Design a protein around this motif. Structure first.
Motif, mmCIF file in Angstrom:
data_model
loop_
_atom_site.group_PDB
_atom_site.id
_atom_site.type_symbol
_atom_site.label_atom_id
_atom_site.label_comp_id
_atom_site.label_asym_id
_atom_site.label_seq_id
_atom_site.Cartn_x
_atom_site.Cartn_y
_atom_site.Cartn_z
ATOM 1 N N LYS A 1 15.606 -4.573 13.702
ATOM 2 C CA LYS A 1 14.476 -4.831 14.603
ATOM 3 C C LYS A 1 14.240 -3.670 15.557
ATOM 4 O O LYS A 1 15.129 -2.912 15.796
ATOM 5 C CB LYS A 1 14.742 -6.107 15.451
ATOM 6 C CG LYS A 1 14.761 -7.416 14.667
ATOM 7 C CD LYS A 1 14.754 -8.627 15.612
ATOM 8 C CE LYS A 1 13.389 -8.890 16.289
ATOM 9 N NZ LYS A 1 13.487 -10.037 17.226
ATOM 10 N N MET A 2 13.014 -3.557 16.063
ATOM 11 C CA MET A 2 12.702 -2.651 17.114
ATOM 12 C C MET A 2 11.730 -3.269 18.103
ATOM 13 O O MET A 2 11.082 -4.206 17.803
ATOM 14 C CB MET A 2 12.207 -1.318 16.558
ATOM 15 C CG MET A 2 10.913 -1.321 15.910
ATOM 16 S SD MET A 2 10.605 0.342 15.262
ATOM 17 C CE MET A 2 11.073 1.443 16.530
ATOM 18 N N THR A 3 11.701 -2.736 19.296
ATOM 19 C CA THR A 3 10.734 -3.106 20.292
ATOM 20 C C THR A 3 10.420 -1.948 21.204
ATOM 21 O O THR A 3 10.969 -0.920 21.075
ATOM 22 C CB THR A 3 11.157 -4.390 21.081
ATOM 23 O OG1 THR A 3 9.975 -4.933 21.662
ATOM 24 C CG2 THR A 3 12.107 -4.130 22.181
ATOM 25 N N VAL A 4 9.531 -2.238 22.156
ATOM 26 C CA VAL A 4 9.005 -1.227 23.060
ATOM 27 C C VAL A 4 9.355 -1.769 24.409
ATOM 28 O O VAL A 4 9.103 -2.927 24.658
ATOM 29 C CB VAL A 4 7.405 -1.042 22.911
ATOM 30 C CG1 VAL A 4 6.684 -0.675 24.222
ATOM 31 C CG2 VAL A 4 7.100 -0.005 21.952
ATOM 32 N N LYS B 1 21.207 -9.795 19.033
ATOM 33 C CA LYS B 1 20.610 -11.145 19.052
ATOM 34 C C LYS B 1 19.075 -11.134 19.293
ATOM 35 O O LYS B 1 18.583 -10.277 20.051
ATOM 36 C CB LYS B 1 21.295 -12.008 20.113
ATOM 37 C CG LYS B 1 22.762 -12.247 19.875
ATOM 38 C CD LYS B 1 23.335 -13.253 20.878
ATOM 39 C CE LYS B 1 24.776 -13.605 20.576
ATOM 40 N NZ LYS B 1 25.229 -14.598 21.595
ATOM 41 N N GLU B 2 18.364 -12.100 18.674
ATOM 42 C CA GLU B 2 16.907 -12.301 18.801
ATOM 43 C C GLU B 2 16.520 -13.157 19.982
ATOM 44 O O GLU B 2 15.429 -13.038 20.493
ATOM 45 C CB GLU B 2 16.358 -12.964 17.562
ATOM 46 C CG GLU B 2 16.446 -12.061 16.365
ATOM 47 C CD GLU B 2 15.451 -12.439 15.287
ATOM 48 O OE1 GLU B 2 15.913 -13.036 14.308
ATOM 49 O OE2 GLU B 2 14.233 -12.155 15.434
ATOM 50 N N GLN B 3 17.459 -14.029 20.369
ATOM 51 C CA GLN B 3 17.436 -14.862 21.574
ATOM 52 C C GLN B 3 18.864 -14.927 22.143
ATOM 53 O O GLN B 3 19.837 -14.881 21.411
ATOM 54 C CB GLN B 3 16.970 -16.285 21.235
ATOM 55 C CG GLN B 3 15.765 -16.350 20.313
ATOM 56 C CD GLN B 3 14.882 -17.554 20.611
ATOM 57 O OE1 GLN B 3 13.836 -17.444 21.283
ATOM 58 N NE2 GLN B 3 15.300 -18.719 20.123
ATOM 59 N N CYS C 1 19.725 -6.817 23.609
ATOM 60 C CA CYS C 1 20.611 -7.959 23.815
ATOM 61 C C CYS C 1 21.915 -7.670 23.131
ATOM 62 O O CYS C 1 22.110 -6.591 22.605
ATOM 63 C CB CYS C 1 19.993 -9.276 23.279
ATOM 64 S SG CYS C 1 20.553 -10.801 24.175
ATOM 65 N N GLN C 2 22.807 -8.647 23.154
ATOM 66 C CA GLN C 2 24.166 -8.515 22.638
ATOM 67 C C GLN C 2 24.149 -8.079 21.206
ATOM 68 O O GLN C 2 23.528 -8.709 20.370
ATOM 69 C CB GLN C 2 24.891 -9.849 22.795
ATOM 70 C CG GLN C 2 26.327 -9.838 22.389
ATOM 71 C CD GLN C 2 26.860 -11.239 22.209
ATOM 72 O OE1 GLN C 2 26.424 -12.165 22.879
ATOM 73 N NE2 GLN C 2 27.817 -11.398 21.315
ATOM 74 N N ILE D 1 17.842 -7.555 19.869
ATOM 75 C CA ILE D 1 16.439 -7.245 20.259
ATOM 76 C C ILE D 1 15.724 -8.578 20.398
ATOM 77 O O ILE D 1 15.499 -9.317 19.388
ATOM 78 C CB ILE D 1 15.649 -6.326 19.240
ATOM 79 C CG1 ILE D 1 16.349 -4.964 18.941
ATOM 80 C CG2 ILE D 1 14.160 -6.150 19.701
ATOM 81 C CD1 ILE D 1 16.309 -3.948 20.031
ATOM 82 N N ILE D 2 15.402 -8.898 21.652
ATOM 83 C CA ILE D 2 14.591 -10.068 22.000
ATOM 84 C C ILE D 2 13.083 -9.723 21.784
ATOM 85 O O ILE D 2 12.605 -8.718 22.280
ATOM 86 C CB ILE D 2 14.835 -10.527 23.483
ATOM 87 C CG1 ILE D 2 16.326 -10.723 23.824
ATOM 88 C CG2 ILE D 2 13.939 -11.751 23.864
ATOM 89 C CD1 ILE D 2 17.226 -11.617 22.925
#
Length: 246
Positions: free
Chosen positions: A155-158, A142-144, A194-195, A1-2
Motif C-alpha cells: 500500500k501507499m498513501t500521501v 496495518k490498514e486500521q 501504522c504498525q 498504511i491507514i
C-alpha cells in the motif's frame, strides 16, 4: 498504511521487505526499507534492536505481496546489520532511528536493477521540502489500528510535511520531536503510517527528483488527530550513511 490505496512494487521499486527467521524456522515480517545502492538497504534501528543478529534476517527486493512471491523478486541475506550507536528510545519517540543492511544473495550478489527493483536517491544535506509539501509513504503495515492482520498487498498513501514548530506544540508531540525527525500527516487525519510500516520510505519530489526524505519511525497510534507520523530526517544523517556504507 491507514487509508491510501493498494499498489505494486513497480510504483515503489526501491521498497525492501524485511523478514526474520525464528528458532523453529518460522518466518514473519519485520519492517520495510529502501534500497539506496545495489548492496545497501536503509531502514529503522527499532525494527532490529531486540534481535540484532544478522543471520536471522531475509530481505526481499521486487516484492509486492507479503506472503506470496512476486515474479522477478530477489531474495537476500544480511551480510551486515548496522544499527545507529546513538539510538535511544521512549516512550515512543525513538532517536537516531536509522539502520543499514548490506545485502548479499546466496550466490554472493547484490541487487540487479530491473523494472521492479531500482534505487532511490538520498537528499542533499539539510535539504528538505517546505512544510505542507505532499510526500508518499509505502508499506505492509496495518490498514486500521484495530486490525490483527497486515495486508497481503503493498500500500501507499500521501501525507503532508509538518513544521517542527507545529509538531513541537504540547498538543502535538511536545519535546518528543527533534530537529533530526520529521512529522507528516493528513489534513483530516484520515490516512497515515501504522504498525508494520516502520523502516520504509517517505519519498518527496525535490527539484524533479524523487528523494528519500524520511524513514517511517514512530507515532502515537495511527491516523489520530494531533498525532502525526514521525520519520527519521535522512538529510541530517548523510555522514553516518556514507561512512557506514563505504
Amino acid at each position: 498504511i491507514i487509508g491510501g490505496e493498494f499498489t505494486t512494487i513497480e510504483n515503489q521499486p526501491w521498497f525492501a521487505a524485511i523478514y526474520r527467521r525464528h528458532r523453529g524456522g518460522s518466518v514473519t515480517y519485520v519492517c520495510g526499507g529502501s534500497l539506496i545502492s545495489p548492496c545497501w538497504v536503509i531502514s529503522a534501528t527499532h525494527c532490529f534492536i531486540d534481535y540484532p543478529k544478522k543471520e536471522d534476517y531475509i530481505v526481499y527486493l521486487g516484492r509486492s505481496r507479503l506472503n506470496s512471491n512476486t515474479q522477478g523478486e530477489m531474495k537476500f541475506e544480511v551480510e551486515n546489520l548496522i544499527l545507529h550507536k546513538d539510538y535511544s528510545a521512549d516512550t515512543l519517540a525513538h532517536h537516531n532511528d536509522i539502520a543499514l543492511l548490506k545485502i548479499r544473495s546466496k550466490e554472493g550478489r547484490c541487487a540487479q536493477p530491473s523494472r521492479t527493483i531500482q534505487t532511490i536517491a538520498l537528499p542533499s544535506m539539510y535539504n528538505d521540502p517546505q512544510f505542507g509539501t505532499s510526500c508518499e509513504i509505502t508499506g505492509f503495515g496495518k490498514e486500521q489500528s484495530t486490525d490483527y492482520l497486515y495486508p497481503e498487498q503493498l500500500k501507499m498513501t500521501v501525507v503532508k510535511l509538518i513544521s517542527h514548530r507545529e509538531c513541537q506544540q504540547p498538543h502535538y508531540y511536545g519535546s518528543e520531536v527533534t530537529t533530526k525527525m520529521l512529522c507528516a500527516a493528513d489534513p483530516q487525519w484520515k490516512t497515515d503510517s501504522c504498525q508494520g510500516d516502520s523502516g520504509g520510505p517517505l519519498v518527496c519530489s525535490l527539484q524533479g527528483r524523487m528523494t528519500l526524505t524520511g524513514i517511517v519511525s514512530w507515532g502515537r497510534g495511527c491516523a489520530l488527530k494531533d498525532k502525526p507520523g514521525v520519520y527519521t530526517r535522512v538529510s541530517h544523517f548523510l555522514p553516518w550513511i556514507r561512512s557506514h556504507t563505504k
